[PDB]
Write a protein that binds this ligand. Structure first.
Ligand SMILES: C[Se][C@@H]1O[C@@H](C)[C@@H](O)[C@@H](O)[C@@H]1O
Ligand SMILES: C[Se][C@@H]1O[C@@H](C)[C@@H](O)[C@@H](O)[C@@H]1O
Ligand SMILES: [Ca+2]
Ligand SMILES: [Ca+2]
Lengths: 140, 140
């Protein structure tokens, strides 16, 4: 079960002002994100973000979540997966609606104190293939 | 418990790097939609400020309610907020003193039927200050 209200598309998801909530309205706050604009005539398929995550313990399963959204929404849709220690730990997720923030998730099992993580693009195209990543989180 | 969190606040990439297929990466301010509480003059802003009749629950289960909130502007009175469910206080009042610092209110409640009555609570009636935004509410 999960009931998530982020107010995208001005959907209040049945939340209402209470008696003490006066003159409520929605605004655009801001959150920092890496932008992937994929310029012309470069190959944008492969590992697009990399990190050697330290502080792990062998045999534990860690959960990697990435908050990601397509932008612009024109031409080719991005397709993004997660990789850990060379192993694909998620299916390729196609990003479709512009500025709809979704979670890309995978789990991996550490073999030691660190793991080599990579976010992977499966679309080499520059026409479209535009998206943003605002958060990468690993929990265990 | 392990957590490695990168949200790029203050442009901290937290040891994430562009991969070979990550061309011309940069940070941007992406939008994130939020309810603004500007608390106008000569109204009482203490009490239940946002509420929802949450459906689809199964009686007896323990649900955890999260709310991402931040003071803004930071002048005059500081907000103070908590969570309430079925008329019961499930979180301690927390003073949001740091402007633009996003914090997560969290509380647990067990359902009493098909639905639950949830309310975010303000403990500051003042209009002088007492300004904040809520960008996300989540129950799971
Ligand atoms: C018409 Se410019 C072409 O399409 C845009 C939607 C972007 O993907 C841009 O990077 C690309 O060069
Ligand atoms: C100087 Se106008 C006074 O203080 C501002 C910081 C806001 O809290 C506004 O709602 C209030 O009326
Ligand atoms: Ca592009
Ligand atoms: Ca105010």
């Amino acid at each position: 079960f999960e009931d998530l209200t982020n107010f995208e598309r001005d959907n209040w998801n049945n939340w209402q002002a209470g008696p003490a909530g006066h003159d409520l309205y929605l605004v655009d706050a801001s959150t920092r994100a890496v932008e992937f604009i994929t310029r012309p005539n470069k190959n944008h398929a492969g590992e697009i973000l990399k990190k050697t995550l330290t502080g792990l313990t062998a045999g534990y399963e860690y959960t990697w979540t990435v908050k990601i959204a397509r932008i612009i929404g024109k031409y080719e849709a991005p397709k993004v997966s997660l990789r850990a220690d060379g192993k694909d730990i998620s299916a390729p997720l196609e990003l479709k609606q512009a500025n709809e923030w979704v979670t890309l998730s995978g789990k991996f099992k550490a073999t030691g104190s660190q793991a080599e993580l990579a976010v992977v693009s499966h679309v080499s195209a520059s026409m479209g293939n535009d998206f943003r990543i605002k958060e990468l989180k690993i929990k265990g």
